[PDB]
Design a protein around this ligand. Structure first.
Ligand SMILES: Cc1cc2nc3c(=O)[nH]c(=O)nc-3n(C[C@H](O)[C@H](O)[C@H](O)COP(=O)(O)O)c2cc1C
Ligand SMILES: O=C(/C=C/C=C/c1ccc2c(c1)OCO2)N1CCCCC1
Ligand SMILES: O=C(O)c1cc(=O)[nH]c(=O)[nH]1
Length: 364
């Protein structure tokens, strides 16, 4: 009607018109965290519910890692209508990340490039922040609004696996799921952790630590992967995930590629690209990972989602849930928009609900 259109066509280009990207991010985290936005009006239909990873998800649309790196805005994100929230990436020690400027808008492409470099308050800060609302989150989770916590590695860390292990020990007890983020393009060497041998060693240690947690505090573990992997890397990932019983995959992070056709002035900035130009590359990665794992490994699909169609494409390709972030362009109304369009499409296409559509392209 008019709620979306005051944001898509006014307020945001006003601010994006004024505010440097990193300033906009920081203000939005602050604004969201204080709950200053009206509560979303879209009431989730039962067709949007999904049961996966040991939990109920009231709707399958989450906020991707990177928006709330330090766990400050979780409640306001649920108020905006996200079915689930992922915070992080969080690193063991605090660290500042790269020098500014380090995040760039490509408005002609509906894309962003970032090179934050894991700016993080650190495990200890985030631990206390989540502990202060831990019981409130236990109720949200029971009511179908689960919390994920995404783990990174410090820049100077001399043992990657021990950084991730420490994350499991400190934040695992506060998370419904953890993510081993081995796919940031902005930390040197990190993506080589995706190789077969390094991945198997790393994930064995992660899983052992997770399994050492008390039962009520024992999160699902997912591995978040890049869109830029070879066929061999994808094969190798699928094989490790199955051998170890990894609980799921997040597909995908940002891309270090620069697709032909980008128009933004800032297209050759170093960093990960997000948004529309990533969309189909991510969808295709989902598609491949789903087939490689025989449809038995839950995938959270992410990259370039800004509509119901985008979401349903990923769900049909094999995602059980989806996330968005970059769709910074449209503001909060995009959340209810994706959800309502996805419900309309599932009905049009003859699905009883999201669950029935998961992986449907592979059974055509
Ligand atoms: C500014 C920014 C910061 C990000 N930081 C993180 C992060 O810390 N950890 C992570 O796993 N993914 C990070 N991402 C990636 C998103 O989680 C997501 O995988 C990617 O942006 C694709 O989705 P989108 O096109 O909806 O934004 C970041 C993305 C952006 C744009
Ligand atoms: O993360 C952001 C922006 C996020 C904006 C998030 C957001 C924007 C408008 C809002 C809001 C939250 O609540 C009410 O109106 N970045 C700016 C562009 C580049 C990437 C960082
Ligand atoms: O630079 C970051 O912190 C970051 C960016 C990104 O695109 N992906 C990620 O995993 N981390």
């Amino acid at each position: 009607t008019g709620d979306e259109r005051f944001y898509a066509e006014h307020l945001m280009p006003t601010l994006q018109g004024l505010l440097d990207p990193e300033s906009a991010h920081r203000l939005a985290v602050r604004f969201t965290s204080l709950g200053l936005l009206p509560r979303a009006r879209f009431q989730d239909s039962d067709m949007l519910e999904v049961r996966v990873l040991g939990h109920k998800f009231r709707n399958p649309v989450g906020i991707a890692a990177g928006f709330d790196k330090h766990g400050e805005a979780v409640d306001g994100l649920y108020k905006m209508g996200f079915g689930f929230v992922e915070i992080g990436s969080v690193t063991p020690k605090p660290q500042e990340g790269n020098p500014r400027p380090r995040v760039f808008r490509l408005p002609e492409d509906q894309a962003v490039i970032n090179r934050y470099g894991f700016n993080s308050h650190g495990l200890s800060v985030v631990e206390h922040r989540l502990r202060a609302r831990q019981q409130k989150q236990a109720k949200l989770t029971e009511d179908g609004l689960p919390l994920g916590v995404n783990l990174g590695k410090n820049k100077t860390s001399v043992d990657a696996a021990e950084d991730y292990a420490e994350g499991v020990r400190v934040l695992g007890p506060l998370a419904d799921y953890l993510v081993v983020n081995v796919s940031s393009p902005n930390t040197a060497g990190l993506r080589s952790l995706q190789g077969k041998a390094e991945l198997r060693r790393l994930l064995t240690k992660v899983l052992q630590e997770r399994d050492g947690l008390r039962r009520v505090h024992r999160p699902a573990v997912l591995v978040k992967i890049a869109p830029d992997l070879t066929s061999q890397d994808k094969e190798d990932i699928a094989s490790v995930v199955k051998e170890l019983g990894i609980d799921g995959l997040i597909v995908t992070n940002t891309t270090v590629s620069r697709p032909a056709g980008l128009q933004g002035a800032l297209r050759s900035e170093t960093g990960g690209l997000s948004g529309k130009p990533l969309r189909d590359l991510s969808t295709q990665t989902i598609r491949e990972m789903y087939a490689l794992t025989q449809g038995r490994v839950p995938i959270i699909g992410v990259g370039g989602v800004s509509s119901g169609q985008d979401a349903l494409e990923k769900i049909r390709a094999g995602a059980s849930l989806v996330q968005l972030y970059t769709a910074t362009f449209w503001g909060p109304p995009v959340v209810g928009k994706v959800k309502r369009e996805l419900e309309a499409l599932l009905k049009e296409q003859g699905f009883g609900g999201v669950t029935d559509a998961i992986g449907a392209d592979h059974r055509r």
